[PDB]
Amino acid sequence: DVLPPMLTSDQKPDVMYADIGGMDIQKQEVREAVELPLTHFELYKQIGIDPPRGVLMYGPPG
Amino acid sequence: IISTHLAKLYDNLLEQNLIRVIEPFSRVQIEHISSLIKLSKADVERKLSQMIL
Amino acid sequence: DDEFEEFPAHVWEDNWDDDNVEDDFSNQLRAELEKH
Amino acid sequence: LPKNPDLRIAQLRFLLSLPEHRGDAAVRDELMAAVRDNNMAPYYEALCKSLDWQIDVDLLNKMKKANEDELKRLDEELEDAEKNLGESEIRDAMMAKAEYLCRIGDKEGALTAFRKTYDKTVALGHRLDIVFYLLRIGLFYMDNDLITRNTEKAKSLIEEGGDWDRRNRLKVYQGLYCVAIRDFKQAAELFLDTVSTFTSYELMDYKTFVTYTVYVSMIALERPDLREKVIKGAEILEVLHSLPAVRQYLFSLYECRYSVFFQSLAVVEQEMKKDWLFAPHYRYYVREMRIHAYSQLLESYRSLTLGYMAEAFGVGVEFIDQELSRFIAAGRLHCKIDKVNEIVETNRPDSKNWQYQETIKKGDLLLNRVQKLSRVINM
Amino acid sequence: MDDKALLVEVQLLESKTYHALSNLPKARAALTSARTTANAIYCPPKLQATLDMQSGIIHAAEEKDWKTAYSYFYEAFEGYDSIDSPKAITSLKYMLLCKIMLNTP
Amino acid sequence: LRPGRIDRKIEFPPPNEEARLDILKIHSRKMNLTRGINLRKIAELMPGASGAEVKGVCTEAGMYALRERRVHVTQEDFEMAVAKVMQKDSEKNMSIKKLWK
């Protein structure tokens, strides 16, 4: 037999895009970097690009 | 701008009204839906056709 | 296998409609509006 | 890219050829104006012979002399390059020779010169330029064989390492050829994939291109795709502001305003008959758009009173009866008329029933093929 | 050349014309260019409020993010109220329109 | 680093001129470039930029193209990509900067 075998990403989050206000630019950039490569990768093939895996956010303390 | 947005709002409100009104209904006389939503038979007929298409 | 010798011998995928009409839909509609 | 030649020349010639516009004073004046301006001596001779025109020697002689002199200087320069310069200029001289041959319209000379230049050349860009000139000559003279041949040629060259500007230009060329050969599905696909990137202003104006995209899209696209890609389309809706008669035609069908749809369909018919690339397609376009309209109306009904449907379509009862009979007979529509009490029932097939019929048909085809295979190989 | 304020003016005029022609993606591109050029120079109250109003119109039309549309419309309204400008009633109308289309009348 | 265990020590200098052009071509082949994109000009506009910067420049031009429902990258798009990638943050503390004459 091969038993199909965790630590993080099982306490399903709650906050939502309706909850976050403003920062449309930040949402756009984080989304294009994080989600679309996972939902519409055809858009990226068409341009012929490597999706930007890895982004960094600046900002004051909060 | 406001004209276009309000026309779309009218369309969506009419769609919601028709759906709720006709939910408790199998076969229905169109005059009845006209009576319930307070519009003209012709307009409700055209909107229903658009919904089905 | 054997050629049956005993028997002597556009690029548009057309499918009929090559009828004879009073134009397709111009004079017909003109007369239609005229009589309505 | 240059205009070798103005396909408006072909438009003018075909518009004159059409019997309704043979006696078009304007059309004739503009055609001869272009002919004199660009000095197409063989083409003018062909026009005269074909259309039975009274030749004007006083200017035809000067036109022949100018053509002869220009060709002589061209080929003299070509010989000078051959005897003095390398390929990098011999090729250019030959290119100029072929360009003048096409601009004067000597079909055989132009084809020979371009073939020789292609044989000589090695650079991909200029190979594609020559192939494009050949495609456009083929389009000019509606020589399906030549157009298709250079079409696979150009696909091969671009696949062998090409660039996106020439990809778009080839796409527009393929679209015009598809409109010629009545393959409106591919025509719509290509046109809508290269409407945001119209760069080929030599073939037609951008207004004309957007009109053609709208027409082919309406005849070849389903309602979902039409909404997504032609009514919600940035450019295809931007130009429709300048084009008022086509915006109405498209939006009539989409909004399900049908009387305006037939008005605009008559408009489009009389436009496309005069057109030169759609001329042997107007009967089919009109008929198929009529079928699209009727099917659209009946897609949301089960028993549509003939009088109401006539009122919606802005016609009578007799006209609707005649044309529905014709289309049901042809098998395009799904509707059966009842003339005693004038009512048009709709016998659309359910999902299961349609799937059954498709299974029967496709399985019949596969059964025929396998039956042939088995009967052949078993014995 | 000079007069980057006039650069922003011309860019917003082009965006308004684009949206009028109904090419929303290209109108948005023009707006983003105008805003990037405005975040390098001094924006008088009039130009800042005009940029905000055009941003509100574009977001209202295209993205369906009527909350941000209302935000920009209100910035435009406040700017026009401060300037005592004729076209503040239009901004307030758009504000109310956003509050309606959000289904929060 | 003794020349008994690591015999040779190759260096990878930040791509110089027209080496930046080579990298631009390599990472722009699978792309949609218009007739009138001057990868050379992009190279000059990018001084002293590592190959990572070249990749990022191509990628950001592509993402800019992705933004406006467009499948074409243009010269100005490459310029904006260069600006967005080669962000040279500089300390604004004029005093700390003038400490040294």
What tokens appear for E47 in the block? 């130009």
**Are there at least 3 beta-carbon pairs closer than 8 Å between F and B?**
no
- How far is Cα E40 from Cα E8, in angstroms, rounded to an integer? 11
Cross-strand partners of D161: none
F33 contacts on D by Cβ (under 8 Å): 163-164
| Contact predicate D290/D309, CB 8 Å | no
Binding residue per annotation — A62? yes
Q: Are strands D336-338 and D303-305 parallel, antiparallel or unpaired?
A: unpaired
- How far is Cα A44 from Cα A51, in angstroms, rounded to an integer? 7
Chain F interface includes E25 (CB < 8 A):
yes
| Residues with Cβ within 8 Å of residue D373, at least 6 apart in sequence | none
- How far is Cα E94 from Cα E77, in angstroms, rounded to an integer? 9
- How far is Cα D367 from Cα E6, in angstroms, rounded to an integer? 74
- How far is Cα D379 from Cα D372, in angstroms, rounded to an integer? 11
Chain B closest CA to D211's CA: distance in Å? 25
What tokens appear for D226 in the block? 């039409």
Chain F closest CA to D196's CA: distance in Å? 8
Please, is A41 exposed, middle or buried when counting C-beta atoms within 10 Å of its C-beta (0-12, 13-18, 19+)? Answer: exposed
| Contact predicate B51/B15, CB 8 Å | yes
E101 contacts on B by Cβ (under 8 Å): 5, 9
| Contact predicate F17/F43, CB 8 Å | yes
Angle at E80 between CA E78 and CA E82, to 5 degrees: 70
* DSSP secondary structure letters along E36-93: HHHTTS---HHHHHHHHHHHHHHHHHTT--HHHHHHHHHHHHHHHHHHT-GGGHHHHH
Distances in Å between the alpha carbon of B9 and those of D213, E97, E103, F92? Answer: 31, 10, 9, 51
SS3 assignment, position D337: strand
Q: What is the DSSP letter of C26?
A: S
- How far is Cα D311 from Cα D294, in angstroms, rounded to an integer? 13
| Contact predicate E73/E52, CB 8 Å | yes
Q: To 10 degrees, the CA torsion angle through A19, A21, A25, A26?
A: -50
Chain D closest CA to E71's CA: distance in Å? 26
Binding residue per annotation — A48? no
Q: Is the dihedral of CA F34, F38, F44, F50 positive or negative?
A: positive
- How far is Cα D376 from Cα D373, in angstroms, rounded to an integer? 5
Per domain, the residue ranges of chain C are 1-36
Q: Within 13 Å of residue E5, how many CA atoms lie on the same side as its CB?
A: 8
- How far is Cα D164 from Cα F29, in angstroms, rounded to an integer? 11
What tokens appear for B22 in the block? 């006709």
Q: What is the DSSP letter of D349?
A: P
| Residues with Cβ within 8 Å of residue D161, at least 6 apart in sequence | D124
- How far is Cα D105 from Cα D113, in angstroms, rounded to an integer? 12
Long-range contacts (CB closer than 8 Å, 24 or more residues apart) made by A28-33: A29/A55, A30/A55, A30/A57, A32/F63, A32/F66, A32/F67
**Residues of F numbered 63-82 whose beta carbons fall under 8 angstroms of chain E's beta carbons: which are they?**
68-69
CB-CB under 8 Å, D301 with B49: yes
CB-CB under 8 Å, F73 with A46: no
E39 contacts on F by Cβ (under 8 Å): none
- How far is Cα E10 from Cα D375, in angstroms, rounded to an integer? 78
**Residues of E numbered 1-60 whose beta carbons fall under 8 angstroms of chain A's beta carbons: which are they?**
none
Write down the residue that tokens 């929060």 correspond to: E104
Cross-strand partners of F33: F73
* DSSP secondary structure letters along B6-32: HHHHHHHHHHHHHHHHHTT-SS--HHH
CB-CB under 8 Å, E25 with F69: yes
Write down the residue that tokens 């044989």 correspond to: D119
- How far is Cα D300 from Cα B48, in angstroms, rounded to an integer? 8
Chain D interface includes C34 (CB < 8 A):
no
Chain D closest CA to C23's CA: distance in Å? 8
Q: Among all residues of chain D, which has the CA nearest to that of C11?
A: D181
Q: Count CB-CB contacts under 10 A for residue D121.
A: 17
SS3 assignment, position D176: helix
Residue type, F82: V
**Are there at least 3 beta-carbon pairs closer than 8 Å between B and D?**
yes
What tokens appear for D236 in the block? 């295809």
**Largest Cα–Cα distance of chain B, in whole Å?**
39
Chain D closest CA to C20's CA: distance in Å? 11
- How far is Cα D328 from Cα F36, in angstroms, rounded to an integer? 55
F29 contacts on A by Cβ (under 8 Å): 48
| Contact predicate D170/D186, CB 8 Å | no
Cross-strand partners of D226: none
Task: Note the helical H segments in F1-101.
Answer: 19-26, 39-45, 51-67, 75-85, 94-98
- How far is Cα F62 from Cα B14, in angstroms, rounded to an integer? 43
| Residues with Cβ within 8 Å of residue F46, at least 6 apart in sequence | F20, F53, F54, F57, F82, F86
- How far is Cα F29 from Cα E50, in angstroms, rounded to an integer? 42
Nearest to F27 by CA among F70, F85, F68: F85
| Contact predicate D345/D303, CB 8 Å | yes
Cis peptide before A52 (omega within 30 of 0): no
